[PDB]
Design a protein around this ligand. Structure first.
Ligand code: U2H
Lengths: 126, 128, 127, 127
């Protein structure tokens, strides 16, 4: 059971996540400028109040390029629930030296975005 | 000899596989203690001759089996195997649950599957 | 700076009943804590939010250890609206200032895992 | 279906072949328990156009757990060309089918890391 190294971004709007070119990568003090590349993956949740199945807000999780449930996807690949972000100067290489997070060892880092980053409408962390 | 799941199946309707966050996913079984609440779901696909004549896939069914029981009885919790997802309730025991075993439909109906109250399901899955 | 939060994820309720737990269970699992620190309270949290509607949202309940959180000064079993108390046998009725509260900018919340063999009332769910 | 090693490859740059002492050569895998630390290295040679001919690139050697990989039905110590066996003190002679092998579509490879104090034969590095 792997997980993301960060906490999710919650979606209240009706449009998918979409960062502008150059921003969207979570801050990580252990990574290098070469690693600032990856993708957000949407995860939907449904529960049972008495109207059978209820649809909750989807949450988006970030995974470094070459890691996570779509580790084999190349940067830019079009897939529902996947959006791509990168910081200029990042290498288009897989980041298998970072990998994914094991919850039984490390806890999720609080996702923080760089100064000046713009989140789309209806997107908030925690 | 040839036994079935103790519970009815969860039918896959969406494009996602059946996954469960930690703690949730184990079907309600009043005849079992909280030590037994641990097992796996095994996907079972069915193919049928479609309206054209070529075989078509039916909606996948997911059958729950307690740990150490069912077709993958000889597998430990968290094993990596396609079509096998693992569920456990906080406080379960990582031991084979032979005392429960598997069902013989000749003398035992299937328990209708029911999930704990407030269980998160992926899209395409429904909790009764 | 100056951000205070619960150490655990919230217990949302979509039913019409308030939160209650039978005696001995109701504290969430925390690996970095001792059985002596298994005593605290749940606090209520109201909220509102298609367009053109002031939608009344479902209330949540955040767990705080005894002597911490927005009601740190309250003693165990104190009577106040929106506040219910939980504890397990073998816990000390002492303030858990060494556990404190969570800074949501440095540490992420711990997923609310109830005790081994504890069922929440109808209308409640964890997320 | 088609799967690859869970780790990256040890590339043979010299003429010597892999050989480990009693209790060394198992890569560091946190998910695996001391029960599972047993397996084998399989040599994977690659051919390329030399520029005129076929040139055998420096053979990469991938590690697969016992029972997993392209050599499933082989027990520990099985003698076969291109296979070297490795164990750790306190493990079991069991087909580790619960570990399996990696689908690169949804899993990155773990960087092959060896415990502190491990010895290696000539020409061996991890890239
Ligand atoms: C809270 C869950 C935290 N655990 C991580 C879940 C877990 C419990 N038992 C496991 C056995 C295997 C596994 O991943 C399969 C695997 C990974 C890497 C290499 C080979 C095989 C994950 C797990």
């Amino acid at each position: 059971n792997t997980a993301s190294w960060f906490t999710a971004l919650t979606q209240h709007g009706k449009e998918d996540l979409k960062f502008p070119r150059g921003q969207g990568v979570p801050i990580n003090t252990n990574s290098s400028p070469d690693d600032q590349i990856g993708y957000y993956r949407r995860a939907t949740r449904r529960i049972r109040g008495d109207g059978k199945m209820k649809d909750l807000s989807p949450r988006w999780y970030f995974y470094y390029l070459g890691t996570g449930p779509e580790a084999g996807l190349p940067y830019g690949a079009n897939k529902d629930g996947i959006i791509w972000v990168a910081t200029e100067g990042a290498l288009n290489t897989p980041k298998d030296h970072i990998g994914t997070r094991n919850p039984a060892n490390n806890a999720a880092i609080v996702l923080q975005l760089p100064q000046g980053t713009t989140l789309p409408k209806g997107f908030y962390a925690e």
